Amino acid sequence: SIRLPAHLRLQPIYWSRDDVAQWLKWAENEFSLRPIDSNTFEMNGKDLLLLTKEDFRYRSPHSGDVLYELLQHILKQ
Amino acid sequence: SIRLPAHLRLQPIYWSRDDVAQWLKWAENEFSLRPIDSNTFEMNGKALLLLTKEDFRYRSPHSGDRLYELLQHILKQ
Amino acid sequence: SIRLPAHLRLQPIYWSRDDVAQWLKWAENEFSLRPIDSNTFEMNGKDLLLLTKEDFRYRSPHSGDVLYELLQHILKQ
Amino acid sequence: SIRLPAHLRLQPIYWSRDDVAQWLKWAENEFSLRPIDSNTFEMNGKALLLLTKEDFRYRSPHSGDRLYELLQHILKQ
Amino acid sequence: SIRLPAHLRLQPIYWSRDDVAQWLKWAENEFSLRPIDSNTFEMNGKDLLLLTKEDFRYRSPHSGDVLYELLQHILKQ
Amino acid sequence: SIRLPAHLRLQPIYWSRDDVAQWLKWAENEFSLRPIDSNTFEMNGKALLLLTKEDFRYRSPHSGDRLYELLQHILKQ
């Protein structure tokens, strides 16, 4: 399963700068990722959807790709 | 007849970050893979399932493919 | 029919690197395949069993799938 | 009712690599298929019998499927 | 109880380096042992039959004795 | 006779690696044995039955002898 927090139930396109932060915070706990500096993902959803797997790795060499695939799944659903 | 260590013999989604690491050390010896940083995949099982062959290979150029393949086997079994 | 050479007469899980290489050279003769470079399967039976048909084709675009089907056949035995 | 050239009437298991290419040529003519390169089936009959429909289809997208069933007919016969 | 692959059912004394490598894989599987590295036993049956339980212990701290007791039963049987 | 957990109702020869581990815990509660590290017996029942009193004692100087005797009794039941 996946189960996303209440607030993030909406399509990624409408996510606010803060939503994206809650999504990172959530993701960290859910998949037991190493904490990343949220100061690296300052942006809403629209632009986030414009990042390549490579941009994610840049902002987080440890969980970047997991975060990318995660996002890809949330959409594909 | 590929058999996982008994303590890991359950769906990867229930695997903890510790199980993943142990999954790794075991795979190295079980399949004679070029050594890798015991903690190269700091994440739990659910996250592991999100990665792609490409993702595995980036984290481990020499053993990533095989690792991906073992996980795919474990699941498709 | 298809009977393996004497010392390969046991589960591929027990096959060593030298056994795999021996398996290829025997396959070539038994099935009249074009020589395969014994530098493409630098692995043992357990590793051998994680490879997909596509992975076999990757090593050998011409005989790859034959070998893969040979393995499944021997496996079903 | 069809009937193979006298030279190929023995069971596929006993077909040489040369017999396999000859079989493709016979089939290409007898069934009006598009050209079939011998270098697509460099193997003897033992190997041929291991190939699945997809495998034929992979070697010949246009004629693969039909080559497969033609082989099947010879076998059941 | 203890059923060896037909191929390794000859007198241990006759086992080759490869036979021993095979026996180690069979044993790990048959007895749910932790992975055993074959480089710790780069020898044939003639040398294997000379080692003491303490030598197995050394070459393999976690399953050396099981392998020793196993070898004994194979001889007595 | 005694109160063996459900999973250990069968003959030790059929015990799985997990059964062994559970057996050790059961034994330590029943005979107030000093907590032993499961990492000491990574093997299944068939392997357990191949161990001698010295082998048991080797893995557990403190409770080895008692575990061996206890198994002989369960075995004799």
The count of residues in chain F is 77
Could you tell me if A24 and A41 are in contact, meaning their C-beta atoms sit under 8 angstroms apart? yes
Query: Across the interface, which of C6, C13, C46 has its CB nearest the CB of E7?
Result: C6
Q: How far is CA C69 from the centre of its chain?
A: 9
What residues of chain B lie within 8 A of the CB of F17, using their CB? Answer: 5-6
Q: What is d(CA D47, CA A17) in angstroms, rounded to the nearest whole number?
A: 60
Q: What is the DSSP string of B40-59?
A: SS-S-HHHHTT--HHHHHHH
Between CA D4 and CA D12, with CA D8 as vertex, the angle to 5 degrees is 105
Q: What is d(CA F20, CA C54) in angstroms, rounded to the nearest whole number?
A: 41
Partner-chain contact C65 D43, CB within 8 Å: no
Locate A8 and state its tokens. 């993030």
First to last CA, chain B: 10
Q: What is d(CA C15, CA D35) in angstroms, rounded to the nearest whole number?
A: 41
Distance from CA of E4 to the nearest CA of C (A): 10
Locate D69 and state its tokens. 């069933």
Q: How many CB atoms lie within 10 A of CB B14?
A: 11
Could you tell me if E70 and E2 are in contact, meaning their C-beta atoms sit under 8 angstroms apart? yes
Distance from CA of E35 to the nearest CA of B (A): 5
From the CB coordinates, do chains A and B have 3 or more pairs under 8 Å? yes
Count how many Cα atoms sit within 13 Å of the Cα of residue B18 in the half-sphere of its side chain: 1
Query: Across the interface, which of E62, E63, E69 has its CB nearest the CB of F52?
Result: E69
Q: What is d(CA E21, CA E38) in angstroms, rounded to the nearest whole number?
A: 6
Q: What is d(CA F57, CA F73) in angstroms, rounded to the nearest whole number?
A: 17
> Which residues have a Cβ under 8 Å from the Cβ of A24 and sit 6 or more positions away?
A36, A38, A41, A67
Q: What is the dihedral of CA B45, B47, B52, B58, to 10 degrees?
A: -100
Distance from CA of C25 to the nearest CA of D (A): 14
Resolution (Å units): 2.3
Partner-chain contact B31 C47, CB within 8 Å: yes
From the CB coordinates, do chains F and A have 3 or more pairs under 8 Å? no
**Which residue intervals of chain E are DSSP H helices?**
17-30, 45-48, 53-59, 64-76
Q: What is d(CA E7, CA E40) in angstroms, rounded to the nearest whole number?
A: 22
Tell me which amino acid residue E37 is: D
Q: What is d(CA E25, CA E51) in angstroms, rounded to the nearest whole number?
A: 19
Locate E56 and state its tokens. 């197995």
Q: How far is CA A38 from CA A19, A35, B42, F17, F53, in A?
A: 12, 9, 18, 44, 58
| Domains of chain A by start residue, with CATH | 1-77 (1.10.150.50)
Shortest CA distance to A27 belongs to which of B39, B67, B50? Answer: B50
What residues of chain E lie within 8 A of the CB of C10, using their CB? Answer: 5-8, 22, 26
- Helix (H, G, I), strand (E, B), or coil: what is residue F31? coil
Locate A27 and state its tokens. 């993701």
Radius of gyration of chain D (CA): 11
- DSSP 8-state code for residue A49: T
Q: What is d(CA E54, CA E71) in angstroms, rounded to the nearest whole number?
A: 14
Q: How many CB atoms lie within 10 A of CB F52?
A: 14
